[PDB]
Amino acid sequence: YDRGVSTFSPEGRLFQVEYSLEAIKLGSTAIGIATKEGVVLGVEKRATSPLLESDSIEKIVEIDRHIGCAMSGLTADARSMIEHARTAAVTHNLYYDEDINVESLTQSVCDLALRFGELMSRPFGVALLIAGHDADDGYQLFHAEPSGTFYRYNAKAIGSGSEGAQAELLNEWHSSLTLKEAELLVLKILKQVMEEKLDENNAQLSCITKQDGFKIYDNEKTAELIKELKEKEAAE
Amino acid sequence: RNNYDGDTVTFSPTGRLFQVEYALEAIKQGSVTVGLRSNTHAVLVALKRNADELSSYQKKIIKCDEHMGLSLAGLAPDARVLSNYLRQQCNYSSLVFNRKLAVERAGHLLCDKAQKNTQSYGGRPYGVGLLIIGYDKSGAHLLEFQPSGNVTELYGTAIGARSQGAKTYLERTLDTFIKIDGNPDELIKAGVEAISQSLRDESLTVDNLSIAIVGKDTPFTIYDGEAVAKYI
C-alpha cells in the first residue's frame, strides 16, 4: 500500500489495526457466557458446501486443561496464536509448578498482536474469546483483539452477529445464572444471528468447569440441548 | 498535512511531525487521569473506562518500583511497553548500584526511549501519555510524558479527554495542595476533586475510580474498588 504498515491515521488509530478489525466483523459468530458454575463457549461452524465434512471445522480449541479458546475472523491466523498460548501455559507450568493464570495467559497472547512491522508483516485478522478457571479469580472470560488490548466480559459475542447478539446478552445475563441456563442461552443467541437454521452440525458448544476442565460437547450432547431449547420456546 | 504524514522521518514544510501529532490524538481519545503532589506525597487519580455493561474497567495505573508508578491514557499496549522498560531501569539501578532510580532520571530515560521512535523508519511514536509519580531523595515528584519525547516536572496536571477541566482546577488550587503535607487522605481528596471537573454525564463509582499514592514512608500503593469508597 501507500502509507506504511505501522502508520497512524490522523485520528490517532493504526490503519492496519482498524482494517484488521473489519475482517473480524465478517467472521463466523462466537459467544461466551460466564457463570459461577463454569464458562461456555459456542461457535457457528458455517460450512460453505454440503460436501464439507462439518466435523473438521475447529473453531474452539483447548489451551490447557483449564483454559479453552474460541476464535472468529481469518481463522488461519489463529494457529500460531494458539501454538504460542499452549507453549506459554505449558512453559509456565515447567518453570513454576503451577497452573498459569487466565489473565496472565491472555496478556501473553496479546503481546503477539503488536509484534508486527517492517516480526510479522501484518496484524492478526482474528479475535479470541479466552475462557478458563484459576484459583485466584475463579471463572473468567476475556476478549483479545489484534489491537493488543483485551477486556474481561461476563459475556461477549464476536463476529457477524455480535452487534445484535451482544445487545441480547446485555439483556439476558445475570450473576446467578446456572451453567445449564447459559448453555441454552448461548444456543438461543446463536440461531438468532446465524444464517443457517441451527442444528448440532453447524454449531458447537463447550465449557470449562473446575472439576472437569475444558470439554468440547459432542454433537450428540449439543443436539439434545438444542431440542431442550425448542421445547422451552415455547411454552410462551 | 496532505503529502507529509506517512512516516516519522518527514518534516512538514513548516517544521511539524504529523506522525507524532496524530499520536497525541490517541491520548486525547483516552480516558482522563490526574496527578498532583505536595512536599511529602504524590497522587494519581484515573477514570477507568469500560466497553459494555458486561466488560471490566481497563486498568490505568502501573507500579514500576516501590517508589515509582504511573498512569496511562491512550494505547494501553504502549504503556505496557514503556512502563515495563521503566521497571527494568528501576531494577538495573537497584541491582548494579544499590540505588533507587531517581524520578528525574526515569524521566530522562523515557524521553530518550521515545525519541528513538521519531528518527527511526519502520518505527512509530508511542500512542500514550504517562503521568509518573514518585518519592526519591529529592522528595515528591510528578512527571508528564508525551509521545513527542517531552517529559516535564509539574505540581499537578491531567491528560485524556476533557482533561482541561481538572487541569484548569489544579491551576486554581495550586497554592493550596502544594501545602498538603503529612496528610495523604487530604491530597487524594484534592485529586478526586480535580478529576471531577472532567466528568460529563458520569459520576465516580467504585468500579471506575482508581487511585495511587506514594511518598515519604509510604511505598507506592494502588487502590481500586472497595478501597476507593472512602473517597466518594
Binding site: - | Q29, G30, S31, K48, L72, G74
Partner: peptide, 6 residues
C-alpha cells in the same frame, strides 16, 4: 465512537 483507548 470506538473506545479501544484506556
Amino acid at each position: 465512537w470506538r473506545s479501544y483507548y484506556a
